[PDB]
Write a protein that binds this ligand. Sequence first.
Ligand SMILES: CCOc1cccnc1Cc1ccc([C@H](F)C(=O)N[C@H](c2ccc(C)cc2)[C@@H](C)C(=O)O)cc1
Length: 293
Amino acid sequence: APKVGRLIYTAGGYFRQSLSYLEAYNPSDGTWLRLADLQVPRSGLAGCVVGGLLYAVGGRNNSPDGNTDSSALDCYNPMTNQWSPCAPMSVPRNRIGVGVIDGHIYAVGGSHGCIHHNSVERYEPERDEWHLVAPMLTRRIGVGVAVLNRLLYAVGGFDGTNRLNSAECYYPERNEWRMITAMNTIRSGAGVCVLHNCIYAAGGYDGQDQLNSVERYDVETETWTFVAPMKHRRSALGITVHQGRIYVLGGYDGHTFLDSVECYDPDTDTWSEVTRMTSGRSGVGVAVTMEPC
Ligand SMILES: CCOc1cccnc1Cc1ccc([C@H](F)C(=O)N[C@H](c2ccc(C)cc2)[C@@H](C)C(=O)O)cc1
């Protein structure tokens, strides 16, 4: 499962306006590479990888001259250092969550102006097509998404009125969503990922405060348990897993757009500062793939 040469890629984000950056961090040597800018600035997007290709999904371009929610899907090839447009989603989705099952990208929730989506759609890379699947039971913007054992999980978010502690799971062979146990904490904008047999939710926003707490859902026991908290409170953070550890990148804490990156070791239940992004930002997309040629 592990292989040499993988980097943590961070795309887009927000600081004063939506950003076009693509930068890649190498845990083996501590370096950052600046790669080709996104074609369109975007914050509130999600990243993922299929077949060694990085995808940037959804978001919004908050710019000097407008706020435009994005239906775009764009693909970055590390081999060529080029972005290529793909077929767009059916609807713009800012503050989206994404997950990959069996080579297919699921785009979950998000907002379009005052519309809070519960809809969900699935992208087929070889065919370059999106199709709608069953909608979630709850409208969720700022939703955390992760995949474990070929099941898709949508965690927390904001329904337009309340921030959510609820979570739900999509069962592909039934094209059906079912609620799971609710989190201990209301979290909009949490970082959500999978590590071992658990879905982690780190940070986020409860409507009053950005959070440093972290909890994990054991898919067998159906319980949420707190683990050690991050050193820095943060919402709208990027997250990924690499070599058995969770990395959280940036975010917002009410005072600062963070450049902090923290790394969680589950065997010691400890967080450790690892590196700082080149500039503070929130609302990034993150994923891991092989280093650029
Ligand atoms: C000071 C202006 O800051 C801006 C302006 C424009 C864009 N981004 C920011 C930064 C920011 C401000 C507030 C926050 C809040 F903690 C926070 O998580 N919110 C949620 C949220 C979830 C996911 C994402 C990606 C963004 C925001 C939303 C759904 C909510 O629950 O309401 C988080 C980040």
